[model samples]
Target: IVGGYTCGANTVPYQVSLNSGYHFCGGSLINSQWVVSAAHCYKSGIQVRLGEDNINVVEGNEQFISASKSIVHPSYNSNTLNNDIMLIKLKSAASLNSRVASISLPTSCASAGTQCLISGWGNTKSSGTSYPDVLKCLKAPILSDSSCKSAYPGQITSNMFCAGYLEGGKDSCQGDSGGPVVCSGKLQGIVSWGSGCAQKNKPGVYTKVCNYVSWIKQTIASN
Candidate 1:
């Protein structure tokens, strides 16, 4: 997160570090072997780490695994960032423990104005290029589609949504993409993109998880 505080240890067991040799993005464990993330984060060196609080040092509870397969949404578009979600299947299933777990996905869309949490290892400042060593977490209020659409206009699609502060100064940044946007103990969104980090009235855009529940299930079943 751009303006987030260091997250509490073992607080977000569902959180996972998506690494390309080093931490590059964040993701959420949806199941024993599946992790959800942003499609744009897809790359060759992708690996998954769970129960990790610090990126620079290994935690005793951490489990590292290589990604066996990466599945980007078939309709994902990099130009407009539509369908910006992806799933990574681990080479082996993760062992669930107090320090590692999976998050529940919503059956339907999260209601507008819901209070949600975003967690990751993104840049601490909008202009900074350095990624944080510790995980960060922040609160982001979900915005109504109409209000969100007004901010991005032609860019806000049905498969996308927004969340952030109206005053700015708090949002997900570069390394946070593909992280979890949790609400009511269920996953409501995936950090996808934004105009810039924590810009005024330019809330972070996300891949609306609810809109793709069927697709996720279908993909999981087939693969």
Candidate 2:
């Protein structure tokens, strides 16, 4: 928590297989019945998957829940990733035993530069395909507000947070579009975008979790 770092997990924010059949990035879990992810990743034949070491590692027998419905924030516009958050209401609440459970959303963000985590199967070398494995995690440092301002110029909205390889390289790519980036044990951000897969000048943007408390509470309450 000293360097403003964070962790990553290729948490495809989708229902089952992904919009274009398993591809996208998003992150969040409102509760047992809801799973939050990025809306852009929602493609044809999309099916959300839990933690799987290998993308082909079908631990299907572990558990399977259909998405009774999905909701993409009305304001979500992928062109700019504005209001880019979405939710997947699992037909049934995950059997909260431990192996299957939802992550807690963060109530507050650490000071800029507080260390956090970033993990996912994004391009390991930029413009690269996702790792064959389902999950790839790494630590990322939060960029100072000024640094982020300098980095994105006018793109860094107040509703978003910036973190990644400030020195270049190491980032989430195409397949990592909709994934989770966690800090401590709280859900913080959902992978939004980067310069390109894993370029040197740009890191990735995440849907600032702290900025949507009302949206989250109301959504869950209605559910």
Candidate 3:
């Protein structure tokens, strides 16, 4: 995350890293066997790493498991990036512990100005490569839908919301997609897209998690 601080170990227990050979995207463990991420991050040969604080170090609490199945939102639009959520079923259930746990899904929508926590191992700069080994976190406030729409005219949709400062600074950047934007201890958003890392008049856009509650529950039940 841009303009963020390093997270303490186990602080974000529900956070997971989607890796092939290296960290590619961030995700949240929603249950013992299911993960929620961005549809755009989907790929084969993915391995989920739970309880990871440092990507470069082999932390003892880390749980590396294969993905048994992956389901992208049926309505996901690649062009507009609408409904950018995805679910991943782990090959085996994660053993829950202090350093590895699931985050509860949101029951209601988060309103504008709600402060949220967004953590990931994404880029720290607006340009060039500056991914962190240790997870970084930023506290961003949800922007009003109207303001979000104004920033990215004709791009913002009902299923997407924007967070962070319009004047630039903090944001979720590349490699952070599919990561959690939690508010009040619940998963409220998933990092989806943005104009730049953290640019003026452009904030990070995210998948509004509340709008897909039924789809998430039903998808998990049937599959």
TM-score winner? 3
Q: On residues 97-166, what C-alpha lDDT tens digit does candidate 2 reach at each position? A: 4444567787787566666666555556564343444455667767777877787888888878888777
- Record all residue pairs in model 1 with backbone atoms less than 3 Å apart, i.e. clashing: none
Q: Which scores better on lDDT, 2 or 3?
A: 3
TM-score of 2: 0.83
lDDT of 1 by residue, 60-177 (tens): 8899999999999999999999999999999999999899999998997888889999999988787757677888999988998888999898999999999998688999988899
Model 2 lDDT at residue 211: 80
Cα distance off (Å), candidate 1, residue 74: 0.6
Q: Is candidate 2 or candidate 3 better by TM-score?
A: 3
User: How do the residues 162-206 of candidate 3 rate in per-residue lDDT, one tens digit apiece?
Assistant: 999988988999989999999999999999999988899899999
Please identify which of the two predictions, 1 or 3, would achieve the higher TM-score against the true structure.
3
Order of candidate numbers by TM-score, starting with the best: 3, 1, 2
Residue ranges of candidate 3 with Cα displaced over 4 Å: none
Compute each candidate's TM-score over C-alphas: 0.97, 0.83, 0.99
Q: Model 3: what TM-score?
A: 0.99
In candidate 1, position 125 carries an lDDT of: 84
Q: How accurate is candidate 1 locally (lDDT)?
A: 0.91
